[PDB]
């Protein structure tokens, strides 16, 4: 089914946004793992794998609309150099993604592409979910303090 | 453990090579799925997920050597526009990767980084495995013919 | 139990014939596997393992008759360079073996070695079984055609 | 993948070495069985089947490197005429094989064929394992004495 | 079905041969048991029960051919007075039986009694099996020596 | 199999290094247990038992090469007097061991002792694994702080 | 609980005695394994692991009494060069240990350290157990003779 050229552009931009999130979360997972914050690390791994799912879903929609998925580049990565910074960087990436999705979503509605519109409403919904979580974690980070938060998310020497 | 600067460079190049393979295989999976060649598609999905594993393994080694993993860019993608071309493109990517790995591997040996050396020997071994498979598939493609090969790797209308 | 010198000669010739078949079938298995004709390959592997059994059985009979089993040489191998040729080469080897077994069998009867005679009748029976199969496969090969036969005996990319 | 002509030569020589071991072990199994040394016989059968595995593995590597596996001939067989001699003959064959493998292995390294190199390191490792075992058995043979060793490896009249 | 008078004669002679073997094996079982060679004894018991089966099979064939089975007498028994002698006596009895069976077998063939012929081929086959075993045991006896062989086939004081 | 005198020297040095690690880890386990840091203690016990395995493996290789394993002495022990010091002492011991293994490993390669070489590559790989872990733990120790780290690795009064 | 300085000295001497036994038994296990005396070897492995338990128990008591466990040295090792010698060397080590334990035990009683006293009574009891066993084995060794004993404790070629 031939799709609206601009909807395809939006989908490809969202895809690039996702590919960026995937790598950012995965690096954070690895980084957090090496810091000994296993519990924080597992969450990052999960979020990265969630984005992989979004990316796949989007690539399929692009092909169906007869466009060409472009995974050649990523937007700028934001790698935190510490526990709190990674939360900040991930949150920063979510806000940019939500901005982009709300925009794409409005355009899909205007052009009448119902299915593509709902995909963005679904993505918007998932991203607000991550935002909710990160905000709660950042809030808990300040309340507990650097050491306390690290303790809560660290693994004992005899773990796994 | 501080690592040899050039070993880290090689690891980051191998990582970029892998991130490229991951996306190339995934696009091929999606493309093959839309062509109705489900069986060919599932194989591509598997190979893409194998590369994801390699990438993760490499990022961890980089962090351990105290380097910084860089997933900001991918090498040029090779997207086939048909069944046979995708096999060709994937095979082309394997040869470039093997070339790079044999090079990195020699350098690790020369510098004495035993563990990093074996990682490249492991990657070289896996890639020769994929090459073996692709060559057999390309050979089978020419023997069966375009239609015959597509038939062998297609899914009936009542599938899954 | 001391056996008839010539029966032992026949047994050693049959053994050499079998050792030849074992290797011919095994190479064909490997060759067919690399061609992507897995189903054809599995049959060759089975036949090779059947011959291994015959060989073992014959070596035991030779030792019992107090002779010396000689596995130092094989008769000329017939390696096909393609699907149909391998069927032809295997069929060619069966005919030579049957010829030899019918001869040995008559001699065992003449000399009165009942048990050795039945072993050759058993071998003759198994070989006629393989001949039956190969003839049916060759016939099916011509009916289906090169591509069709290869298709029927090929494995999909997502196999095993 | 086209391979180095000399690596293929080495692989075919190793193959010939293995085909030789297979038959030597199998004859020893049969011989030992007729002597009533069932326990010694079962070990020989196992070792013969191990070599069969090595041979298969090597034939596959040869085909992948686009060479032609040659199973037409075997190196000279060494058939012991008694319990201790068979141990000696098998040990003699191991030393020749190890010599050949260490040589092939060095060449693979020099030419940079990593995978083929590791195959020879794997074979070298397995062969040193058999050598270890045989040396321990020969040592135990002299300590126990001909009759004692035969007793330890013999089966009672009511066995199996 | 009225049978050939001479085939019936042969069957009755074979029967007498078997009734003889049954008792010879059973006495040997008992003797060996009293000597404390339980493992040697169990084998003799098994062989005796095998012959019982042969005898039954033969009596049935005789009745079918409308002849009269005669179990009134046995051929001369051969009772060994020691471990090795019993093996010798049993082996001596096998050779006489095989001689008789090969003779009966030829006659059945000449007269065209197919079924009776195969019975003798079956008996010949079983007897060569026992001969094979006994020869291996006698060989093992000389290799191990009187004491060693007795040890291998003896039961500990706390057995069964 | 007679081995290279100097390879045996290296193996015995590696053995001494391992016997040292075994006792150092075990004392640390006991010490940490008495401090109430059960989780830290269990990890030390595991590492000590890992080294026991290495030691056994090395003693076996020495005997095979016909050398004489020498477990009469240990290198200087490094007993920490507190949580962080034990991590430091264990890390210090790993670096010395890696130094020794890389040296032995190069020599095995030079002399062509393939199997012994791989044992050192295996040991080097395991030790880099422990180093990775200890570095992550030391890093986590400074991030959490003395009290926080002790808390994370301590057992409640109602434990086990 | 601060302990009697001399009790701690005795405990550390007993510890050194045990660390010595551990290594002596383990070397004997390995040696016996290479000789092909698997059954004798498994017993040595068990005894070595028993001593490991004693050592651990003693180190814990030392720490509780606020002393410092010293595993830096071992008493002189006694490595037998043959089956019977290893039994002799192990027995020699037991007698020295018992001598030391009876001495430490008396001192603990005199000073009133009840718990430490019972530990030595427990060790004395276990050691007399090993002595009982070794004496029975040495006696059985002379009764059976070198070859007979080796036979009883050897493993067949098809073992494990
Ligand atoms: C940044 C590089 C990537 C890394 C490090 C990575 C890592 C992983 C790993 C190791 C898994 C296996 C499941 C598990 O570990 O629990 C996984 C699964 C998956 N990845 Fe990736 N991945 C990467 C990129 C991608 C991208 C860009 C795509 C394709 C568009 C993708 C799509 C998927 C999907 C859909 C799964 C789920 C598979 C399943 O569980 O059935 N991944 N990835
Ligand atoms: C020289 C004469 C040979 C004899 C008498 C012999 C005997 C045997 C026997 C009795 C089996 C039958 C299956 C079983 O026991 O489970 C076996 C298995 C096997 N043989 Fe042979 N063999 C011979 C040669 C070979 C050759 C030339 C190859 C390949 C180049 C080979 C490779 C194997 C393999 C891979 C198996 C394993 C089957 C499995 O576990 O799936 N054999 N052989
Ligand atoms: C000469 C003295 C014989 C002795 C001491 C003897 C001993 C034995 C023993 C102890 C059994 C009892 C069942 C069992 O153990 O399970 C057995 C089974 C048997 N005997 Fe005999 N037997 C003798 C003669 C015969 C004869 C003359 C025949 C037939 C002509 C014969 C045929 C059989 C058969 C067919 C069985 C198998 C039963 C079954 O498995 O269903 N036996 N015999
Ligand atoms: C001198 C060299 C030593 C060697 C070669 C050695 C060997 C072994 C082996 C192979 C194990 C591994 C686990 C298993 O087999 O299940 C074991 C277990 C054990 N070892 Fe050692 N060991 C040595 C020294 C020690 C020392 C110094 C101690 C303590 C002071 C010790 C205490 C133990 C304990 C308590 C276990 C029992 C594990 C359990 O059952 O939970 N070992 N040792």
CSV table of N, CA, C and O and ligand atoms in Angstrom, one decimal, chain A residues 15 19 22-23 26 45 48-49 52-53 55-56 59 71, chain B residues 19 22-23 26 45 48-49 52-53 55-56 59 71, ligand 1:
chain,number,residue,atom,x,y,z
A,15,UNK,N,12.6,6.0,13.7
A,15,UNK,CA,13.4,4.8,13.7
A,15,UNK,C,14.8,5.2,14.1
A,15,UNK,O,15.5,4.5,14.9
A,19,UNK,N,16.9,3.7,17.2
A,19,UNK,CA,18.2,3.1,17.1
A,19,UNK,C,19.2,3.8,18.0
A,19,UNK,O,20.1,3.1,18.6
A,22,UNK,N,18.4,2.5,21.6
A,22,UNK,CA,18.9,1.2,21.8
A,22,UNK,C,20.3,1.2,22.2
A,22,UNK,O,20.7,0.6,23.2
A,23,UNK,N,21.2,1.9,21.4
A,23,UNK,CA,22.6,1.9,21.8
A,23,UNK,C,22.9,2.6,23.0
A,23,UNK,O,23.8,2.3,23.8
A,26,UNK,N,22.0,0.3,25.9
A,26,UNK,CA,22.9,-0.8,26.0
A,26,UNK,C,24.3,-0.4,26.5
A,26,UNK,O,24.8,-1.2,27.3
A,45,UNK,N,19.1,-2.8,30.3
A,45,UNK,CA,19.1,-3.9,29.3
A,45,UNK,C,17.7,-4.1,28.8
A,45,UNK,O,17.4,-4.2,27.7
A,48,UNK,N,16.5,-1.2,26.6
A,48,UNK,CA,17.2,-1.3,25.3
A,48,UNK,C,16.4,-2.3,24.4
A,48,UNK,O,16.2,-2.1,23.2
A,49,UNK,N,16.1,-3.4,25.0
A,49,UNK,CA,15.4,-4.5,24.3
A,49,UNK,C,13.9,-4.0,23.9
A,49,UNK,O,13.4,-4.5,23.0
A,52,UNK,N,14.3,-2.0,20.8
A,52,UNK,CA,14.6,-2.9,19.7
A,52,UNK,C,13.2,-3.3,19.1
A,52,UNK,O,13.1,-3.3,17.9
A,53,UNK,N,12.3,-3.6,20.0
A,53,UNK,CA,11.0,-4.0,19.6
A,53,UNK,C,10.2,-2.9,18.8
A,53,UNK,O,9.6,-3.1,17.8
A,55,UNK,N,11.7,-0.4,17.2
A,55,UNK,CA,12.4,-0.2,15.9
A,55,UNK,C,11.9,-1.2,14.9
A,55,UNK,O,11.6,-0.9,13.8
A,56,UNK,N,11.8,-2.5,15.3
A,56,UNK,CA,11.3,-3.5,14.4
A,56,UNK,C,9.9,-3.2,13.9
A,56,UNK,O,9.6,-3.3,12.7
A,59,UNK,N,10.1,-0.4,11.3
A,59,UNK,CA,10.6,-0.8,10.1
A,59,UNK,C,9.6,-1.5,9.2
A,59,UNK,O,9.5,-1.4,8.0
A,71,UNK,N,18.6,2.6,8.4
A,71,UNK,CA,19.2,2.4,9.7
A,71,UNK,C,20.7,2.8,9.6
A,71,UNK,O,21.5,2.3,10.4
B,19,UNK,N,27.7,-3.7,14.5
B,19,UNK,CA,26.5,-2.9,14.5
B,19,UNK,C,26.0,-2.8,13.1
B,19,UNK,O,24.8,-2.7,12.9
B,22,UNK,N,24.3,-6.2,12.3
B,22,UNK,CA,23.0,-6.3,12.9
B,22,UNK,C,21.9,-5.6,12.1
B,22,UNK,O,20.9,-6.3,11.9
B,23,UNK,N,22.1,-4.4,11.8
B,23,UNK,CA,21.1,-3.7,11.0
B,23,UNK,C,20.9,-4.2,9.6
B,23,UNK,O,19.8,-4.3,9.1
B,26,UNK,N,18.9,-7.4,10.0
B,26,UNK,CA,17.5,-7.1,10.4
B,26,UNK,C,16.7,-6.5,9.3
B,26,UNK,O,15.5,-6.9,9.2
B,45,UNK,N,16.9,-13.2,10.8
B,45,UNK,CA,16.7,-12.7,12.2
B,45,UNK,C,17.6,-13.3,13.2
B,45,UNK,O,18.2,-12.7,14.0
B,48,UNK,N,21.1,-11.8,12.8
B,48,UNK,CA,21.2,-10.5,13.4
B,48,UNK,C,21.3,-10.5,14.9
B,48,UNK,O,22.1,-9.8,15.5
B,49,UNK,N,20.6,-11.4,15.5
B,49,UNK,CA,20.6,-11.6,17.0
B,49,UNK,C,22.0,-12.2,17.4
B,49,UNK,O,22.4,-12.0,18.5
B,52,UNK,N,24.3,-9.3,17.6
B,52,UNK,CA,24.0,-8.5,18.7
B,52,UNK,C,24.8,-9.0,19.9
B,52,UNK,O,25.4,-8.3,20.7
B,53,UNK,N,24.9,-10.4,20.0
B,53,UNK,CA,25.6,-11.0,21.0
B,53,UNK,C,27.1,-10.7,20.9
B,53,UNK,O,27.8,-10.4,21.9
B,55,UNK,N,28.5,-8.0,19.5
B,55,UNK,CA,28.6,-6.6,19.8
B,55,UNK,C,28.7,-6.4,21.3
B,55,UNK,O,29.5,-5.7,21.9
B,56,UNK,N,27.7,-7.1,22.1
B,56,UNK,CA,27.7,-6.9,23.5
B,56,UNK,C,29.0,-7.4,24.1
B,56,UNK,O,29.6,-6.8,25.0
B,59,UNK,N,31.8,-4.8,23.5
B,59,UNK,CA,31.6,-3.6,24.3
B,59,UNK,C,32.1,-3.9,25.7
B,59,UNK,O,32.8,-3.0,26.3
B,71,UNK,N,29.3,3.5,19.7
B,71,UNK,CA,28.3,3.0,18.8
B,71,UNK,C,27.6,4.1,18.0
B,71,UNK,O,26.4,3.9,17.6
H,1,LIG,C1,23.0,-1.6,19.9
H,1,LIG,C2,23.2,-2.9,19.5
H,1,LIG,C3,22.4,-3.9,20.0
H,1,LIG,C4,22.7,-4.7,21.1
H,1,LIG,C5,23.9,-4.5,22.0
H,1,LIG,C6,21.6,-5.7,21.2
H,1,LIG,C7,21.5,-6.7,22.1
H,1,LIG,C8,20.5,-7.6,22.2
H,1,LIG,C9,20.6,-8.9,22.9
H,1,LIG,C10,21.9,-9.5,23.5
H,1,LIG,C11,19.4,-9.5,22.7
H,1,LIG,C12,19.0,-11.0,23.1
H,1,LIG,C13,17.9,-11.1,24.2
H,1,LIG,C14,18.5,-11.0,25.6
H,1,LIG,O1,19.7,-10.7,25.8
H,1,LIG,O2,17.7,-11.1,26.6
H,1,LIG,C15,18.6,-8.7,21.8
H,1,LIG,C16,17.3,-9.0,21.4
H,1,LIG,C17,16.6,-8.3,20.4
H,1,LIG,N1,17.1,-7.2,19.7
H,1,LIG,FE1,18.9,-6.4,19.9
H,1,LIG,N2,20.6,-5.4,20.2
H,1,LIG,C18,21.1,-4.3,19.5
H,1,LIG,C19,20.4,-3.7,18.4
H,1,LIG,C20,19.2,-4.1,17.9
H,1,LIG,C21,18.5,-3.4,16.9
H,1,LIG,C22,18.9,-2.0,16.2
H,1,LIG,C23,17.5,-4.2,16.5
H,1,LIG,C24,16.9,-4.2,15.2
H,1,LIG,C25,16.1,-3.1,14.7
H,1,LIG,C26,17.3,-5.1,17.6
H,1,LIG,C27,16.2,-5.9,17.8
H,1,LIG,C28,16.1,-6.9,18.8
H,1,LIG,C29,14.8,-7.6,19.1
H,1,LIG,C30,13.5,-7.4,18.5
H,1,LIG,C31,15.2,-8.5,20.1
H,1,LIG,C32,14.2,-9.4,20.9
H,1,LIG,C33,14.5,-10.9,20.6
H,1,LIG,C34,13.7,-11.9,21.5
H,1,LIG,O3,13.9,-11.8,22.7
H,1,LIG,O4,12.9,-12.6,20.9
H,1,LIG,N3,18.4,-5.1,18.4
H,1,LIG,N4,19.4,-7.6,21.4
